[PDB]
């Protein structure tokens, strides 16, 4: 009976493959044969933030496009005013092994997590004027690799085992648990409407989950190696992933297949962070060879290179108004580019 | 700058000052990543102190030691092992009762071979190019009856000489020693220990002092 189920699953995979082949009448690279290229993008370092003293592993922008969180390999989660290079907060973490950051859309809460398997949510706006651990979310088995805020009540976390969770904050138990991956869920990204989200794991595949319904909608394959970063398109119908194959890949939700492969022969090392610019034209991807390339999301040619970091880039983010790009690297400085 | 902007700059400078003292306090503190082939001998290494990763903060001779155990992580370790790139040293726990007890499967993939594979994946890692290993052999009292009841035949099919403790333990130590490839940039110290010895912290302090003075000779540009 097990062999019959395996053969039926193989037939289903073949059916998915031929449906994707039938729906693929053309390519995006074929259509973008007469479109105007972006030219060369000259992004220079407007600000540098020289406060951390260890390797920065995460960074997240506030929705006001001004405040930054950044976590390093001390107990330090620093909140910066990026306009005036000013530290507005320095939250001391109980565990220095932090691999992720989150800034709430309201800006009240900041989440952290990492090798300590728990998600600490800090309330910034308290009557006592300090930062307090508003919540301590436990229940994940592996290391917490990514966390994103839906709103002030709910948070979606991705762990180092084959699960993702949607939690509640006033009651610290998980609202739902998404379990369809086979591998360590290394990245997680939310739609702008926050109704669906894509999680990318170590099985070289991304999955699109519905937050309210609680089950997988689509599974996207194509990557040779495990993927480390996913960002949605600003339209919300597409997303680009980056792996250790040195290839970004733009998948589309409604086509249920990949559209583009951003690759170059000069780059061979993996991709750590991927973020779209506003309107979804540029694609800033940070690599392991100390650089940060800018691709065009429509045609696979490369724009300028954000080469200013002395170590590898671990996180990169674009503001909600698209003003500037903050790249946090493995040296202690994170640089703001425009 | 306005009045509130000047006061915010003053607050940021005070944050810079306190953060610099916190970083200087954290700098004078050695980090030991404690790895092992499951629950074999790590319990005793925690036991002469005197969730996922667990951190112990013992001290010895006015030196603060932070020892991290990640045996409860139980995931694919290549994604998070770069967080321990800046540790002072890698303590490795290998049980000498690992052979002849397979403990995982029916007949294959015994404990000594997976301990070998974990050691080879750790000492030849791309991040641990220069960190040293303070590899332990945690079963001294149990090894003599293990080699008395059974020869070293179910692993290392080559001869171990005889069934006495000294040359067999030297064979285990030598076969763990030649496993690394970068013989120059890192060293394995290979202490032998039991569950009653209290000299583990002295050998750890000696290896830590060697790593510190080698890092200082790196820092002064003379190594």
């Amino acid at each position, epitope marked *: 009976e097990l062999d019959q189920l395996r053969q039926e699953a193989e037939q289903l995979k073949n059916q998915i493959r031929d449906a994707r082949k039938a729906c693929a009448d053309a390519t995006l690279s074929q259509i973008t044969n007469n479109i105007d290229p972006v030219g060369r993008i000259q992004m220079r370092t407007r600000r540098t933030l020289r406060g951390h003293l260890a390797k920065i592993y995460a960074m997240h922008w506030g929705t006001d496009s001004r405040l930054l969180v950044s976590a390093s390999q001390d107990g330090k989660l620093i909140i910066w005013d990026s306009y005036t290079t*000013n530290k507005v907060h320095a939250i001391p973490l109980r565990s220095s092994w932090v691999m992720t950051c989150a800034y709430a859309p309201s800006g009240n809460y900041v989440a952290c997590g990492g090798l300590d398997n728990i998600c600490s949510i800090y309330n910034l706006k308290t009557r006592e004027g300090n930062v307090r651990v508003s919540r301590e979310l436990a229940g994940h088995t592996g290391y917490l690799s990514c966390c994103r805020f839906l709103d002030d009540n709910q948070i979606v976390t991705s762990s180092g085992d084959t699960t993702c969770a949607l939690w509640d904050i006033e009651t610290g138990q998980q609202t739902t648990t998404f379990t369809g991956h086979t591998g360590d869920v290394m990245s997680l990204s939310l739609a702008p409407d926050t109704r669906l989200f894509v999680s990318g794991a170590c099985d070289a595949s991304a999955k699109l989950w519905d937050v309210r319904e609680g089950m997988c909608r689509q599974t996207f394959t194509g990557h040779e190696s495990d993927i480390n970063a996913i960002c949605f398109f600003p339209n919300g119908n597409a997303f680009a992933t980056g792996s250790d194959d040195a290839t970004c890949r733009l998948f589309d939700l409604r086509a249920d297949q990949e559209l583009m492969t951003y690759s170059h022969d000069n780059i061979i090392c993996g991709i750590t962070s991927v973020s779209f610019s506003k309107s979804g034209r540029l694609l800033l991807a940070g690599y392991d060879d100390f650089n940060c390339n800018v691709w065009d999301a429509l045609k696979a040619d490369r724009a300028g290179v954000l080469a200013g970091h002395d170590n590898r880039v671990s996180c990169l983010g674009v503001t909600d108004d698209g003003m500037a790009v903050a790249t946090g690297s493995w040296d202690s400085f994170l640089k703001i580019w425009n | 700058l*306005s*009045a*509130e*902007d000047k006061a915010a700059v003053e607050r940021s400078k005070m944050i810079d000052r306190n953060l610099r003292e916190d970083g200087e306090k954290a700098a004078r503190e050695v980090k030991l990543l404690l790895l092992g082939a499951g629950e074999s001998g790590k319990s005793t290494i925690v036991k002469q102190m005197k969730t996922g990763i667990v951190e112990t903060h013992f001290t010895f001779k006015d030196l603060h030691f932070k020892m991290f155990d990640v045996g409860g992580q139980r995931s694919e370790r290549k994604k998070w092992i770069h967080c321990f790139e800046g540790v002072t040293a890698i303590i490795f726990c290998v049980a000498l009762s690992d052979y002849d007890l397979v403990l995982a499967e029916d007949e294959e993939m015994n404990r000594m071979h997976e301990s070998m594979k974990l050691f080879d994946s750790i000492c030849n890692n791309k991040w641990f190019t220069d960190t040293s290993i303070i590899l332990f052999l945690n079963k001294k009292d149990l090894f003599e009856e293990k080699i008395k009841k059974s020869p070293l035949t179910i692993c290392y099919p080559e001869y171990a000489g005889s069934n006495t403790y000294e040359e067999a333990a030297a064979y285990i130590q030598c076969q763990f020693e030649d496993l690394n490839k970068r013989k120059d940039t890192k060293e394995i110290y290979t202490h032998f220990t039991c569950a009653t010895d209290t000299k583990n912290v002295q050998f750890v302090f000696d290896a830590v002092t060697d790593v510190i003075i080698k890092n200082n000779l790196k820092d002064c540009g003379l190594f």
Partner: single-chain antibody
Amino acid sequence: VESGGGLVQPGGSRKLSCSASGFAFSSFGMHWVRQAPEKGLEWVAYISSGSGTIYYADTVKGRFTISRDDPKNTLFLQMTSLRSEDTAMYYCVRSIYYYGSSPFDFWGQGTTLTVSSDIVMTQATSSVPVTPGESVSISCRSSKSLLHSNGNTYLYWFLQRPGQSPQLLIYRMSNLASGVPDRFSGSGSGTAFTLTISRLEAEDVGVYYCMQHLEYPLTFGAGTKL
């Protein structure tokens, strides 16, 4: 909370002492603004976070000395030379200064002791009808336009209910504080500022003060009692 201080003295020297209760006193700048029994509020002294920059008013520059002790969370104002001008309720104020902060948010209970250039804030209106449920508006004018280059006017509106300490209503132009209802708004730009009330209850009566925060010898607005 915070309270404590001194009492009546003829022409002597006194150390006012207030004790902070559980709001991380070391990270808060502290003001010592004072209020005469029939006049309005006026600013006296300021100690910053970690005893850094210290500011005084133009009349108490040498006579007064403000200090803090982060052990026991205590604040001192030592006055050596005492005149007949400074018989007042002395109203200790906390204020934290970061980007999204709301300074002057919490005020001490105030202790009364009897002895026996700058921006001039007018507030020409002083009395309005006390009827509830209406929409009363309170205007404010300054001498210099307190619009800074970063784009926010540093003008604050406080409510002093008759009987207790004044409470911050809005901490910029159109920046509602915490714990204040949504019936207030800033609606000011440049020099003219216009606080407005949607509906008046019995708890909205009191004296309304406007305070600039552009340059540090900061002046209040002499009150507009409803």
